[PDB]
Structures are given as structure tokens and as C-alpha cells.
Ligand binder design. Structure first.
Ligand SMILES: Cc1cc2nc3c(=O)[nH]c(=O)nc-3n(C[C@H](O)[C@H](O)[C@H](O)COP(=O)(O)O)c2cc1C
Length: 122
């Protein structure tokens, strides 16, 4: 995991799951800037049609300190909908307390026959 490779955000469980850090990929993906992200909650990416039950699964997972993944619909700054494969993982300290969550986002795109050929024979 690198911040100049990958797309993720870090939430502070001690400051109410406010985002404390976002990677470059996240700003590129969503088109939002730091002023729209840092200190906020990523639920701002949700919008019309976002699945309520998936969002409830995310909420329950965070409440429980559990790892999680799920596809949900999100919205870029210009209002473009995209499918977000969101992976959540808790971060604990020494004591085994959840102090942060990391969230890793993948904008769904078509996986092609070409990419598959590449994958099995790099
Ligand atoms: C580290 C982290 C990253 C998150 N990233 C996203 C995201 O990219 N898109 C999204 O819709 N929700 C994301 N969420 C979920 C929202 O922050 C929120 O937890 C979710 O909408 C359910 O809670 P709510 O019902 O109070 O909104 C993320 C949560 C955490 C903790």
C-alpha cells in the first residue's frame, strides 16, 4: 500500500470517523479536493440509488470493528455516478483498541478478455 499508487482514506475513530488523510488516488477518483474531504465523512460520496442496506452493512461493520468489502454507488464532484468497491479494515493500537479505519476504494471498470489474457500471462 502506497499513497502515490493506491486509493484510500484513513478515518479517525477518536474524532468520530472523520477523514484524517486521503491518498492522491482518492482525489483523482472522486474529483474532490482536500477542502471537501479532510475532517468530513465519506458518506458525502453517496447519492441517489446508493443501496441503503449495503450502507447499513458498512455501518454495522464499523460499529463492530470488523473488516468489510462491498460495492456501492458513489458520485464524483461533477455528479458522475460510479461503482465503488470499498474495502474497510480497522486499525488497533497496543491495547487492541480501534483507533482508525482504513478504506480502500476501487472504481469498477469493465474487466476485458484482454486484461484476462494479460493476467494469466503477464
Ligand atoms: C475509512 C472509511 C472509508 C469510507 N469510504 C467510503 C467511501 O469511499 N464511500 C462511501 O460511500 N462510504 C464510505 N465510508 C462509509 C461512510 O463513512 C459511512 O461509514 C457509511 O455511509 C455508513 O454510515 P452512515 O449510515 O452513518 O452514513 C467509509 C468509511 C470509513 C470508516
Amino acid at each position: 500500500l502506497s499513497t502515490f499508487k493506491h486509493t484510500f482514506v484513513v478515518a479517525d475513530a477518536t474524532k468520530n470517523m472523520a477523514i484524517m488523510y486521503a491518498s492522491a488516488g482518492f482525489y483523482e477518483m472522486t474529483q474532490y479536493g482536500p477542502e471537501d474531504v479532510i475532517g468530513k465523512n465519506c458518506r458525502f460520496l453517496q447519492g441517489p440509488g446508493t443501496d441503503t442496506e449495503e450502507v447499513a452493512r458498512i455501518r454495522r461493520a464499523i460499529k463492530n470493528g470488523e473488516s468489510h468489502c462491498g460495492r456501492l454507488l458513489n458520485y464524483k464532484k461533477d455528479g458522475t455516478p460510479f461503482w465503488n468497491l470499498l474495502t474497510l479494515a480497522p486499525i488497533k493500537n497496543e491495547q487492541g483498541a480501534v483507533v482508525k479505519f482504513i478504506g480502500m476504494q476501487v472504481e469498477v471498470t469493465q474487466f476485458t478478455e484482454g486484461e484476462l489474457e494479460k493476467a494469466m500471462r503477464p
